[PDB]
Design a protein around this ligand. Structure first.
Ligand SMILES: Cc1cc2nc3c(=O)[nH]c(=O)nc-3n(C[C@H](O)[C@H](O)[C@H](O)COP(=O)(O)OP(=O)(O)OC[C@H]3O[C@@H](n4cnc5c(N)ncnc54)[C@H](O)[C@@H]3O)c2cc1C
Ligand code: SF4
Ligand code: SF4
Lengths: 490, 117, 410, 410
């Protein structure tokens, strides 16, 4: 009769002070100690029908682990002190738990039974602690599949879906190849995700392990003019398509032409590449230490941009978002099974609040922008307040407030108000169709119009997460193995 | 081993007590089980006296099930771990449960809204 | 792995204490006749399997070798030699006109069958027929052997020698020349040793508290003998646990409800584990169960004045040292469990005479033999400030060394 | 490297070529009897020393085992078993009614005295008397053992059995039931092998350009015997190098009284060419100087139409294959050096009969036996399109396998 959820309170592991955290581009969190991990795992009740494992979209938002993690099982193992068994059970489902332990927003935490009237259990932190302990003890080594049947799949894209598919096929016994455009493999993890949230050392170690396994990555290849789909199909049985989704939507408004506006993707990529190459000394990026930064469009990209600007010591940084601020508690129409929509105050914001003394504020809301300045570099940014109202048949619509005209200084502007599908129709060599820039495919039976070609990842899922990409990659690996051989265990 | 044996014997004794049989000697001959999904032909051939209202699967199907389980277990060339059970708990990808999370949350939401769809 | 080395060490220590030179140890450390044979056996499937058999004879100066045959897959030359030396020690302790012998076969009786076992026994007897007989080597049963196997071996030897030879092998059924008391021999010997130890220590058997760890045939017979003598059994144990009652345990009812395997515990009743059974308050403790049960942690917690090792090696060196410090009288297994060997010797004598004794005669003769051996060992260990184990080893080696010297082998 | 494992391997391939199941190999790979004994011997200084002795019997299906005994300190169970298997192979090749046997003692006769050796031999016979005899196991001499030791063993066995048993042991002096031709047995055997090989081929014995790597004892004897009809070309490996290099010239008979201890035949300071000469266009080759002289590198260099092995392991498998491909006849040592075993068999027959033959009868019977064996081996090798060594191995194992199958052991 465990009573941990009653007699134990949720805690957090060691965290560096936000004020001093801007002086270094390293991890902003640490794993739980042994005692803390045991105490936190004691909270889990060994849930009957665990809602922390459903892994499905509810009301348009994902709930639970999409990869069906054995959360109660390794929670109990951690509580009992069994670490090797916990790591083995975790790896039974997640092949890259190191990334998820510090990147995933943990919808499982929100969609758990203990989340009602009490805080949930730190599933993400426990996973991070397990994987960190395993790596430190050196229990993670290449499996070296003795069974190798001559077969090629030639995955394209080094994103988490690509890595997962490559690992699954290699363990099956197929010698695959992963083509990446950028110098360093890892897809979004290497470049899009900040080093602060995920240092690239672990990513590089993972690629090293995969290479030792025999994935044989190849970089600096756009697989377009460089390599053609015809020869790809001729020399490979399957080809897959883990192209992801990097296309970014823009605003077709006047004033978005003055020099000083760059993509958030490009800015983050340049910053991380310079940091990896020469510690942001080659000056091959955008720096706004003495220049104001206005980032419009909230989300992970906006938070990463704000954190990068703060570490670059920008004089002023501001975040714009049209949607209203979240409340501090669940609303009537938002209960536990749904993903919570409450105030979070994640990283890149507490740092700004702690540092900025003259302007200890952030989260400018109900306004994106309107027509900006011109005549060379940016001088000012115009903003107008917007309100959500019910019109016609109780449908949300945006109304502007004429009396709320205001202007802000903006010497640098970033746009992160959403994303589009994969890079099409640029990559039209294949005959794969699309509807909304997403290659036509269905969850399960990823076969495309062309035989031997399988859609995967964000390319078909739209905008998703690393865990979703891993799940998709595992399913396509199973499907392609079955297609090539007839049977596929996983 | 000793504790397992004693506990199993006690459980068997409880199972006998359910029907009121106080002696394993009598329970051994007695067939206090009723089949659900076994053909009457198979029952008569091998389980004579047992009840099967709807009949059901045949010896070929039984052999196919056993062979399937054996074959997947013996091949199983991906994992060194046992799959989680779903007998008294619900696991994604496991055996179906009538009161699954989807049904539970849908019913709760419908009752709290007083909503029909 | 080190069983032979340990046996050699104890032999060396005993000879050093007795004062014999090093040539005696050189002669007695290894057997002077080891035979390895290959037995082809036709199996039920029709195939032929080659089994490996060993037979070791430590010495024959005192008389014909006496040994046992075990059907185990882990048998080895080193184990066979060590057990032959141990059998020689037992025979010397009991003052029998025997040497040490040991036989073994690499096999798995669990997978073998009835007819395959018969064929294997016959083949082994044939392979070793050239060096065994009623006057050379007398086998007996051991692990995975019994009266049926002994009868098969006896039939084989008679069929070879053209006349019946009951004395060639012991452990036979009564109809084939077996002896009474073959089942209660070990328990009766343990009872005799317990009574003698109690007499020496001044403990009166009447009302003495006895704890028995193990309720197999030996444990059941020992408990019955104590109950008949008047001692109260305050604790017994089986595979499922143990019971405790300071005022008595109703051994009659316990034996009545005893099954074939010796289980007497109830189903829905909590039992006493062996660890805390060994720590119960008693005057006599008798482990006749699994080995390595007494160690440093429980040696101080043991409250028994006398401990008798009915089983094989239930005590360690540290436990023996602690018990000696605490002044607890320890009766070694090599002496306590000699009842079976003594009864086999009686069976051999009966076969030689053609006259078969009764239960009472066997009882009295075993009583005298065991009492004499126990008294000799106790007097030796009192004259020399040593342990009963070392005294027993010295008594065992003395006869063999003297016989070899007299015959001129050294 | 392991001699025992190599023997098991050659037995396995021979049986596979003959087309026999794996149970035959399982039976014949390991001897069915291995007796290890400890012999106490009273030395001249009054002390007592324990010696270790081994006796291996491989297969008695064909008949009583026949085996030699060697007094060496480096003997081992594996070596004894391998030598027993090799003896069985030789007996099968010669078609004798014998099985494989061998014996050994861990001792240094160079250190032991005459009386000590007598006592040791008597003790060995006493120890193994139960499993040896004219009908079970026939000992013979080997390295560091001679007719005096054989006579002592015979006397001890006769005393044990209460009657004279000359046939129990071979290698005895003439007065005790010895046989003629014992000394020249091996040399005569190689001579008959050479003559039969030449007759089978188109070569005659008049010219007979002969290369020899011996010139010591056996080499000198065979060279002298050849000199009557054939000629010589070069002699190599005379313990000092190519001291002899006539290169197309003969050698005067110098076998009266000469030895390699002082010079070789005339003088040690004579011209020496080099250690290894070989080569030359000869028609007969007799390599016996050391183990494995012929290797892959020099396999194609030799230019001899016929090669007859007279030592143990003078050629490797690669060399044998190369010679077979080149179509050069190769007489295995196992067949070439069977004269001693054949003469021991003749001595056993004479002991059984009570009638003792003459040198002429021994010579003619040896000629008949070796000629028959050579013809059988050559015919079977031609029929199977294989090498003489493998043919000899199969001929040796065929008798044992057939006897075991007939008797029902497999
Ligand atoms: C905390 C958190 C923060 C996040 N922050 C961000 C963020 O700032 N930005 C963001 O975009 N997502 C972000 N995400 C989402 C996440 O990064 C993606 O959803 C996911 O990683 C993409 O999966 P993928 O397998 O498609 O990877 P991808 O990286 O999309 O895989 C494809 C890779 O191959 C490259 N490629 C493209 N075309 C080709 C070709 N023809 N040949 C070879 N290679 C090609 C792509 O550039 C890319 O690097 C975040 C998620 C979390 C949980
Ligand atoms: S905390 Fe999550 S995983 Fe644990 S029992 Fe509750 S819902 Fe299940
Ligand atoms: S990967 Fe994400 S959803 Fe799954 S257990 Fe970890 S934090 Fe929860």
């Amino acid at each position: 009769k465990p009573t941990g959820f009653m007699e134990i309170k949720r805690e957090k592991p060691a965290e560096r002070d936000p004020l001093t955290r801007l002086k270094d581009w390293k991890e902003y969190s640490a794993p739980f100690s042994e005692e803390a991990s045991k105490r936190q795992g004691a909270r889990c009740m060994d849930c009957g029908t665990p809602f922390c494992q459903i892994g499905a979209d509810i009301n348009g938002f994902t709930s639970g682990c999409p990869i069906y993690n054995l959360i109660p099982e390794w929670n109990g193992l951690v509580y009992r002190g069994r670490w090797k068994e916990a790591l083995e059970r975790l790896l039974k489902t997640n092949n890259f738990p190191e990334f998820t332990g510090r990147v995933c927003p943990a919808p499982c935490e929100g969609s758990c039974t203990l989340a009602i009237s009490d805080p949930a259990v730190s599933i993400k932190n426990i996973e991070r602690t397990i994987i960190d302990k395993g790596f430190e003890n050196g229990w993670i080594q290449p499996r070296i599949p003795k069974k190798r049947t001559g077969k090629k799949v030639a995955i394209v894209g080094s994103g988490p879906a690509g890595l997962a598919s490559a690992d699954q096929l290699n363990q099956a016994g197929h010698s695959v190849t992963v083509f990446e455009r950028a110098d360093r493999a890892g897809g979004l993890l290497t470049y899009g995700i900040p080093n602060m949230k995920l240092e690239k050392g672990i990513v590089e170690r993972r690629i090293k392990l995969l290479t030792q396994e025999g994935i044989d990555f190849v970089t600096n290849t756009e697989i377009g003019v460089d390599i053609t789909a015809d020869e790809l199909k001729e020399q490979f049985d399957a080809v897959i398509l883990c192209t992801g989704a990097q296309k970014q939507r823009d605003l077709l408004i006047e004033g978005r032409d003055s020099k000083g506006v760059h993509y958030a993707m490009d800015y983050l990529t340049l910053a991380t590449k310079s940091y990896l190459d020469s510690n942001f000394k080659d000056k091959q990026f955008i720096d706004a230490k003495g220049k104001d930064v206005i980032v419009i469009g909230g989300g992970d990209t906006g938070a990463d941009c704000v954190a990068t600007a703060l570490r670059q010591k920008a004089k002023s940084v501001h975040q714009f978002g049209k949607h209203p601020k979240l409340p501090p508690a669940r609303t009537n129409d938002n209960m536990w099974p749904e993903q919570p929509h409450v105030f979070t105050l994640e990283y890149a914001y507490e740092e700004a609040e702690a540092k900025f003394g003259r302007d200890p504020r952030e989260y400018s809301i109900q306004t994106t922008k309107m027509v900006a300045d011109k005549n060379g570099k940016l001088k000012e940014l115009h903003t107008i307040q917007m309100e959500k109202v019910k019109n016609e048949h109780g449908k949300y619509e945006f109304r502007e407030l004429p009396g709320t005209e205001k202007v802000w200084p903006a010497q640098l502007v970033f746009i992160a108000i959403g994303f589009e599908g994969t890079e099409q129709p640029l990559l039209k060599q294949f005959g794969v169709n699309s509807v909304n820039n997403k290659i036509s495919a269905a969850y399960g039976d990823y076969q495309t119009n062309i035989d031997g070609v399988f859609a995967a990842g964000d390319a078909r899922r739209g905008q998703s997460l690393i865990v979703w990409a891993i799940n998709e990659g595992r399913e396509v690996a199973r499907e392609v193995d079955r297609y090539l051989m007839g049977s596929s265990v996983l | 081993v000793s504790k397992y044996g004693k506990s199993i014997t006690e459980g068997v004794v409880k199972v006998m007590s359910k029907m009121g049989i106080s002696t394993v000697q009598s329970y051994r001959g007695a067939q206090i089980f009723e089949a659900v999904g076994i053909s009457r032909d198979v029952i008569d051939r091998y389980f004579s006296g047992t009840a099967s209202q709807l009949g059901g699967i045949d010896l070929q199907t039984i052999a196919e099930e056993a062979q399937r389980r054996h074959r997947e277990a013996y091949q199983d060339d991906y994992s060194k771990t046992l799959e989680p059970g779903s007998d008294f708990q619900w696991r994604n990808g496991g055996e179906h449960h009538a009161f699954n999370p989807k049904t539970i949350h849908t019913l709760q939401w419908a009752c709290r809204r007083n909503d029909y769809n | 792995l080190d069983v032979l080395k340990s046996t050699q060490t104890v032999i060396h220590k005993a000879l050093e204490k007795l004062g014999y030179p090093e040539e005696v140890y050189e002669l007695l450390k290894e057997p002077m006749r080891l035979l390895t044979v290959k037995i082809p056996v036709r199996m039920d499937d029709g195939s032929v399997k080659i089994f490996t058999g060993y037979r070791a004879q430590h010495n024959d100066s005192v008389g014909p070798t006496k040994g046992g045959i075990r059907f185990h897959p882990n048998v080895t030359e080193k184990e066979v030699k060590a057990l032959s030396i141990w059998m020689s020690l037992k025979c010397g302790i009991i003052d029998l006109p025997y040497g040490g012998g040991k036989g073994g076969i690499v096999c798995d009786p669990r997978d073998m069958s009835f007819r395959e076992l018969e064929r294997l026994s016959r083949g082994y007897v044939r392979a070793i027929s050239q060096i065994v007989g009623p006057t050379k080597d007398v086998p007996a049963p051991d692990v995975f052997t019994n009266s049926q196997i002994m009868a098969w071996m006896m039939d084989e030897y008679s069929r070879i020698d053209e006349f019946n030879s009951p004395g060639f092998i012991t452990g036979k059924p009564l109809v084939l020349g077996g002896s009474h008391g073959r089942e209660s021999a070990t328990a009766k010997g343990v009872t005799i040793c317990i009574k003698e130890a109690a007499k020496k220590r001044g403990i009166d058997i009447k009302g003495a508290r006895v704890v028995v760890q193990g309720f197999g045939n030996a444990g059941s017979y020992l408990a019955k003998f104590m109950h008949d003598a008047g001692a109260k059994v305050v604790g017994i144990s089986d595979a499922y646990g143990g019971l405790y009652d300071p005022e008595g345990l109703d051994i009659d009812y316990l034996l009545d409800r005893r099954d074939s395997f010796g289980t007497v515990t109830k189903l829905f009743n909590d039992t006493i584990t062996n660890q805390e059974l060994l720590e119960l308050d008693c005057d006599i403790l008798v482990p006749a169960a699994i080995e390595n049960q007494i160690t440093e942690e429980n040696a101080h917690n043991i409250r028994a004045k006398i401990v008798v090792e009915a089983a094989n090696g239930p005590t360690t060196l540290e436990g023996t040292k602690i018990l000696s410090d605490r002044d607890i009288l320890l009766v070694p297994d090599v002496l306590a469990s000699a009842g079976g060997v003594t009864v086999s010797y009686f069976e051999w004598v009966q076969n030689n005479q053609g006259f078969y004794w009764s239960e009472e005669e066997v009882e009295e003769k075993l009583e005298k033999m065991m009492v004499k051996s126990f008294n000799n060992i106790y007097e030796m260990a009192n004259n020399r400030r040593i342990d009963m184990r070392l005294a027993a080893y010295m008594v065992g080696v003395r006869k063999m060394a003297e016989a070899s010297r007299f015959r001129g082998w050294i």
